[PDB]
């Protein structure tokens, strides 16, 4: 076995049906007999007990500490990791055929595969084919000018930029990425620092990073407006399921 499904939670079973049920069901839509979930401990390290009342095919739950990011959660869960991982988030409501994303991880033997959607602040730049992303940054770390290296333009003279895209927080990741995460404690969150680090490190036996663009669904974001939109669309989403 080489994929080990991993679910992050740092959520709340809100909605008509429990929120965490929605992504987990997707895992049982395509194989994935076993799954690892990590719960929060700042509120209470017992949400696993509450979640144990569901009826999924098979569940594995692990408590965490009070303060721990996604990268910190992976750092804690590493001893249970033996192969490539598939990190998801509890807040994610989508009907994506997952087989596309892993195909980028499969065909090109990439070091990272992610899902990215046309939202309806953070800049990303992919190549002409729209598969291998080349640059990514956020306005938080940029003052007024966006900087592009000469070498990347030498290797790729045509970059297509996207601005309003929304991440789905789903990533196929290699094992040596987790080993490097072990080697350095300076990383606390995946999205905040880890992905841009790899993107920059692609250009110093190299690093391959790919993103798949979708046009159907986003994740239930922290704002309550996203939860309301997810509730509105849940009837249509579950009509097929």
């Amino acid at each position: 076995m080489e994929f080990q499904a991993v679910v992050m939670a740092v959520l709340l079973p809100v909605g008509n049906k429990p929120l965490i049920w929605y992504p987990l069901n997707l895992l049982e839509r395509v194989g994935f007999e076993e799954v690892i979930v990590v719960t929060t401990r700042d509120v209470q390290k017992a949400l696993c007990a509450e979640f144990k009342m569901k009826m999924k095919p098979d569940i594995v739950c692990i408590p965490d500490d009070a303060d721990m990011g996604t990268a910190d959660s992976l750092r804690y869960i590493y001893p249970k990791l033996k192969t490539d991982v598939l990190v998801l988030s509890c807040d994610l409501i989508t009907d994506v055929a997952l087989h596309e994303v892993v195909d980028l991880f499969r065909a090109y033997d990439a070091s990272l595969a992610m899902l990215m959607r046309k939202g309806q602040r953070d800049f990303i730049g992919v190549d002409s084919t729209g598969k291998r992303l080349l640059f990514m940054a956020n306005e938080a770390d940029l003052d007024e000018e966006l900087v592009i290296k000469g070498s990347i333009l030498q290797k790729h003279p045509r970059i297509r930029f996207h601005t309003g895209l929304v991440d789905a927080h789903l990533y196929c990741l290699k094992k040596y990425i987790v080993d490097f995460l072990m080697e350095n404690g300076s990383i606390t969150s995946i999205r905040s620092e880890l992905i841009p680090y790899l993107v920059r490190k692609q250009f110093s036996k190299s690093l391959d990073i790919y993103s798949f663009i979708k046009e159907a669904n986003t994740l239930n974001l922290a704002p309550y407006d996203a939860c309301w939109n997810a509730c509105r669309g849940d009837r249509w989403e579950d009509l097929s399921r």
Binding site: F123, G125, E139, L142, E144, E145, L146, V147, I148, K149, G150, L153, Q154, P157, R158, I159, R160, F161, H162, T163, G164
Partner: protein, 427 residues
């Protein structure tokens, strides 16, 4: 609906050809035994222009004399060239301001430099420009011509390499900057927020220096005094966004050739491309300028032979070689990837590689010449070896038994040339 008009600038206002420019205008430099002005004029005639104006400031007499005896000045020609001369011109801004003041253009004219080698057909770009002007109610003001390429091609010189950020949907230029002496590039974030539908950064383009312009360009030039060159105008318009928006659009071609010679690097690249039929129908044997001397015959390996060449016994023309009429070739010569002007004289056992010899050049036997340039009426003595990138200008004769260094530009005029002499290289 009005006939097409093209303003032609016959003066490269910078100084990138000294000391060559001190004796002959750059626009009249023979590329393939044909003046660059003839190439640009033939391009304009083929693309459909009917009226052209050529503005000359440096050595206007020679340019006028060459033009009046050219094909385009005949009454049968479809282009009515008009030579405008004035010694007060100092930049393209002055030329455009004079165009606005004299009020030549009616609408939707062409702006090109006088040293452009191209065969682009601008009908599609012209239609797009006119359609956008009519739809947007005189918002769009400029259209640029760029040729797709790779950042490693020799034509993409490090001096004039450029990078753009454009709108993929509407072909609208949003940022434009040269890349000389830069390891990283900066792009303003504001253009992202105005249109979040997706900008695209392009580095694979090549600046053909071809523009479709509106009288609004002339008005902006005659208002903005500080503007001197096209790049200055583009940057000023792209920094003064909200006031007089005046969106700039771009047209990219990938099936036709277009370039602008600006230095010996570009000159050599363009000559190599032209000899290799990269600018078809323009060809040395095509004789697009109906002159008797440039009649040529085409053979295998692009060996172009003029009339009365008289190849010597044992000599070998390897490939990509053009010989002017009246040339004389010695014995066991080895000429490769070079151009020999009419009336030259070459000795025995001479080796020529990637060189360029204009009319009247004389070379003694046994010389080795690589990648250098020899202006007209130059002469080389025996046992002389020229290193790559050497230059010989205007009848300078190199003395026997000497090997010039790598960077060796010499001319009659003392100060500009690194060395001046007439019978040697040592002082």
């Amino acid at each position: 609906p009005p006939p097409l008009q093209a303003v032609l600038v016959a003066d490269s206002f910078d100084r990138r050809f000294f000391p060559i420019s001190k004796d002959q205008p750059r626009v009249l430099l023979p590329l393939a035994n044909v003046a660059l002005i003839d190439y640009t004029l033939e391009f304009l005639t083929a693309t459909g222009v009917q009226e052209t104006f050529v503005f000359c400031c440096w050595k206007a007499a020679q340019i006028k004399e060459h033009l009046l005896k050219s094909k385009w000045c005949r009454p049968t020609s479809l282009n009515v060239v008009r030579i405008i001369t004035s010694e007060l011109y100092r930049s393209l801004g002055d030329v455009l301001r004079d165009v606005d003041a004299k009020a030549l253009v009616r609408s939707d004219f062409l702006l090109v430099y006088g040293d452009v080698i191209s065969n682009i057909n601008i009908t599609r770009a012209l239609e797009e420009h006119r359609l956008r002007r009519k739809l947007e109610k005189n918002v769009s003001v400029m259209t640029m011509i760029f040729k797709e390429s790779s950042p490693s091609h020799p034509t993409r010189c490090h001096e004039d390499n450029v990078v753009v950020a454009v709108d993929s949907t509407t072909n609208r230029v949003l940022h434009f900057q040269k890349t000389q002496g830069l390891r990283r590039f900066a792009f303003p974030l504001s253009l992202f927020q105005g249109s979040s539908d997706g900008v695209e950064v392009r580095y694979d383009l090549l600046d053909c220096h071809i523009s479709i312009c509106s009288p609004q360009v002339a008005q902006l030039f005659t208002d903005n005094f500080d503007y001197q060159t096209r790049d200055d105008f583009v940057r000023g318009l792209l920094v003064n966004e909200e006031i007089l928006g005046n969106q700039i659009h771009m047209h990219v071609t990938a099936k036709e050739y277009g370039a602008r010679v600006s230095n010996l690097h570009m000159y050599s690249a363009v000559c190599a491309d032209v000899i290799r039929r990269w600018v078809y129908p323009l060809t040395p044997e095509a004789n697009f300028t109906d002159s008797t001397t440039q009649s040529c015959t085409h053979s295998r390996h692009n060996i172009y032979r003029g009339p009365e060449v008289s190849l010597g016994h044992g000599s070998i023309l390897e490939e990509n070689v053009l010989l002017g009429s009246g040339t004389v070739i010695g014995s066991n010569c080895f000429i490769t990837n070079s151009v020999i002007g009419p009336g030259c004289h070459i000795g025995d056992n001479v080796v020529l590689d990637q060189t360029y010899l204009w009319q009247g050049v004389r070379v003694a036997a046994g010389a080795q010449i690589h990648q250098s340039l020899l202006c007209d009426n130059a002469e080389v003595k025996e046992r002389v070896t020229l290193k790559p990138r050497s230059v010989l200008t205007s009848q300078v004769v190199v003395g026997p038994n000497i090997t010039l260094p790598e960077g060796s530009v010499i001319s009659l005029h003392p100060p500009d040339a690194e060395e001046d002499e007439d019978d040697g290289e040592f002082s």
